[PDB]
């Protein structure tokens, strides 16, 4: 039984349900799925200032307990046609993971909200970065189609990995 | 066994040795490997006139037969970040597979040669259109640790794909 | 008074009534206009066989002459985010234009219709290797927005090109 | 006299070198050159412990300043081919100035340093995205062609946005 990490960051919550409805998905597909948010930076203080609405008990990832799992599935909120800037500041710091070579061969997936397509791009480079095999897309509040779309997603990854164990 | 196909496009020849590179890895990889190239586009007369270096004896590929195979490895020379003209308009041809979902779950993977990343990106995008999965790179004449790298990558996919099998 | 080149690919009509409105747009800019279509690559048998829809009275443009304006509006169709392989083979015929420093400094702006954002980059990127201003975008057949959107574009470019001379 | 802004990020040095350069070279357009530095997110503590070379000196930037200047040049450090987490944070926050039109027609330029490609153009798009006018590349330590490829660079988008004025 392969495990699964969705990560994810979103601002006003519409990333968050894509992240969910991929998680659900995914232990569909048979998987030890894990659903956790990146880190947000700036302190705890001022931080629901203004905006806010990012969820308590979706538990913090690290950055380097992404080697744990056998797949990974990233879903963030895009502005200007790229990441936001927690989701980059977050994954940079996998510089230890990428000389080890401990993300080669993991199986991933990206999912994106609002520049889309750059934004989509930019990120699964990233992925590809680190070797990583890629799953393609597809093909307020989301929409029911955005919601299957991330759930089968979710699930063919689930799908894909354990068919390369 | 697998059936993978080596579809590429060179101008002078760089991509042509990168494409033989991953043909002949990927048959250490145990695949029934298909060696093609892209159809020329503009007439056989004055084609060879100023530049050229086109190879004879490597088949002519169709733009319908892509989803015969379980794995396809493409190799383009590209221009200004963009793949060449031959194989962009070969591609757009695919619109039968596409809508078909011939392509899907199929694996792929890309080679490029001179706006590299660009170029890299530009091509593995179109592929992901057809839902391919896809497998990331490496990490005058090709240098050793191109040739290496096209040969590895060739073997790589060869690899993946059968697992998938 | 500046002379401005409109030139365009269009497989379906609508990115050449884009290519009117910027033309158009770019007169009321007062500039000298001049609106042509990239040579269809392949026979003109069999070319309106199936999907057909190109413009006759439309002048074709040579490679070389786009180096006779101070402004150039480019707009293509495209398919899987990126240029039709006949404004892309175009292009690269512009490599007598790129090492002579003919198009550096020359006011540039590009539209696009269908992987919409990877295909204006893309040609946005070919057109800046050549040292071309850039001047961005906006903010069946095509809508009163789009060509109002291209109306104004044309417009400023050309306005944007007179200031600079 | 035009007023320009060299906003950059560094986290080593290598960009602070390529933003000093543009900054003189602006200077020889004939600009009032302002040389400011993106805020760092994370506290002052842990910052400069392991990895560490801000310069303190340079002023710090506001997200809102960006509306003074004529034309802004923006040069920043890259990984796995997109911005820096510090530049991309505040870039996001110049929300007010999008809307409000207030960078529209402004001249702008773009550096980067090390996925280079798709760096450089993430970043200039998010600057397209506020209508800003774009002015393309040249065409341990910066060697000496980077320096004075910032120094053209520079000298050229304050010669170019002074002739807009």
């Not at 927690?86 to 993300?103: E, H, S, V």
């Not at 307020?140 to 955005?146: F, G, K, N, V």
């Given at each position: 039984?392969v495990?699964?990490?969705?990560?994810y960051?979103?601002?006003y919550?519409?990333?968050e349900?894509?992240?969910?409805?991929?998680?659900?998905?995914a232990?569909?597909?048979?998987a030890?799925?894990?659903?956790?948010?990146?880190p947000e930076?700036?302190?705890?203080?001022?931080?629901?200032?203004?905006h806010?609405?990012?969820?308590?008990?979706?538990p913090?990832?690290?950055?380097?307990?992404?080697?744990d799992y056998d797949?990974?599935?990233?879903?963030?909120?895009?502005?200007?046609?790229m990441?936001?800037?927690?989701m980059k500041?977050?994954?940079?710091?996998?510089?230890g993971?990428?000389?080890?070579?401990?993300?080669?061969?993991?199986?991933?997936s990206?999912?994106?909200?609002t520049?889309?397509?750059?934004?989509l791009?930019?990120?699964?480079?990233?992925?590809?970065?680190?070797g990583?095999?890629?799953?393609?897309?597809?093909?307020?509040?989301?929409?029911?189609?955005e919601?299957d779309?991330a759930?089968?997603?979710?699930?063919?990854?689930?799908?894909?990995?354990?068919?390369?164990?």
């Amino acid at each position: 039984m392969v495990k699964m990490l969705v990560l994810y960051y979103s601002a006003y919550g519409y990333m968050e349900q894509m992240a969910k409805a991929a998680a659900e998905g995914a232990r569909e597909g048979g998987a030890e799925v894990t659903l956790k948010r990146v880190p947000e930076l700036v302190p705890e203080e001022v931080a629901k200032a203004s905006h806010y609405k990012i969820d308590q008990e979706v538990p913090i990832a690290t950055p380097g307990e992404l080697a744990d799992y056998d797949a990974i599935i990233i879903g963030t909120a895009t502005r200007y046609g790229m990441m936001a800037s927690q989701m980059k500041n977050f994954l940079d710091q996998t510089g230890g993971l990428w000389a080890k070579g401990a993300l080669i061969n993991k199986v991933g997936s990206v999912m994106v909200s609002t520049g889309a397509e750059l934004a989509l791009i930019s990120t699964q480079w990233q992925m590809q970065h680190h070797g990583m095999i890629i799953v393609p897309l597809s093909y307020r509040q989301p929409s029911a189609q955005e919601l299957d779309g991330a759930r089968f997603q979710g699930r063919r990854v689930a799908e894909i990995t354990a068919k390369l164990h």
